[PDB]
């Protein structure tokens, strides 16, 4: 079933976003106990952007792996060049959906930082 490749990649991506939320809560919790200047706060925002970069890296990597599996399925004849085109398409919308979610997690990290 060609859908299962897309489903595993979704699972992975949704997990990685939940790890990000977690990491930004660690970052916010150890910001809270401190009391911050502008320099220190800009550093945390930058660490938050770097933590998102990392999530995006991991999800990019999950997608490379999904495409490699997809290619094996294609060689076994369990999916064709069109379905492989559809999968590629879904994996890019997926990356964007995960990216949007990580951004919302950032914006909410800052709003919590400053207010």
């Amino acid at each position: 079933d060609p859908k299962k490749v897309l489903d595993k990649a979704k699972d992975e991506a949704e997990n990685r976003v939940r790890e990000l939320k977690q990491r930004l809560e660690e970052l916010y919790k150890e910001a809270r106990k401190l009391d911050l200047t502008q320099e220190m706060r800009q550093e945390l925002v930058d660490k938050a952007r770097a933590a998102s970069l990392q999530a995006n890296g991991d999800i990019f990597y999950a997608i490379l792996r999904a495409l490699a599996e997809a290619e094996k399925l294609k060689k076994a004849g369990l999916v064709n060049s069109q379905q492989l085109d559809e999968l590629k398409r879904r994996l890019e919308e997926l990356a964007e959906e995960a990216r949007r979610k990580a951004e919302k997690l950032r914006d909410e990290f800052r709003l919590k930082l400053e207010y």
Partner: protein, 149 residues
């Protein structure tokens, strides 16, 4: 053994810059490694462009600040491990700092940034790259994405 990481970094930054109309002048690695990495990087930037744009806009950059900014990002990027996607994120991060440098009339910072990428690779990522099959493993991993384009 494994491939010369200075060469990988130089070709990669050279291409990012020349793709934006800037000419940057400053074991031997196969063409396919270079080509694979510029394509995976371009692919990464197309998906994650909005995130770098938000980074690079919110970047006060000076020759004396630049290293600190680079350090914070790559430290967080590789905090709990390496994988090929983090490596590609790394490459494109360093590319974005180079492009921003030329944009802000601070071109000599591209030489420094290429140095930092080179030293981070040689000192922190090399043994993980080698343990995971070298840059040839990467070429093989990305091939299925290449064969779609």
């Amino acid at each position: 053994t494994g491939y010369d990481n200075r060469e990988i970094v130089m070709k990669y930054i050279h291409y990012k810059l020349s793709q934006r109309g800037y000419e940057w002048d400053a074991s031997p690695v196969p063409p396919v490694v270079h080509l694979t990495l510029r394509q995976a990087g371009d692919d990464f930037s197309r998906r994650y462009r909005r995130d770098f744009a938000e980074m690079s806009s919110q970047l006060h950059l000076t020759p004396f600040t630049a290293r600190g900014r680079f350090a914070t990002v790559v430290e967080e990027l590789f905090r709990d491990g390496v994988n090929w996607g983090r490596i590609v994120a790394f490459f494109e991060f360093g590319g974005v700092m180079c492009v921003e440098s030329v944009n802000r009339e601070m071109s000599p910072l591209v030489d420094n940034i290429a140095l930092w990428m080179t030293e981070y690779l040689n000192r922190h990522l090399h043994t993980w790259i080698q343990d995971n099959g070298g840059w040839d493993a990467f070429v093989e991993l990305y091939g299925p994405s290449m064969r779609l384009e």
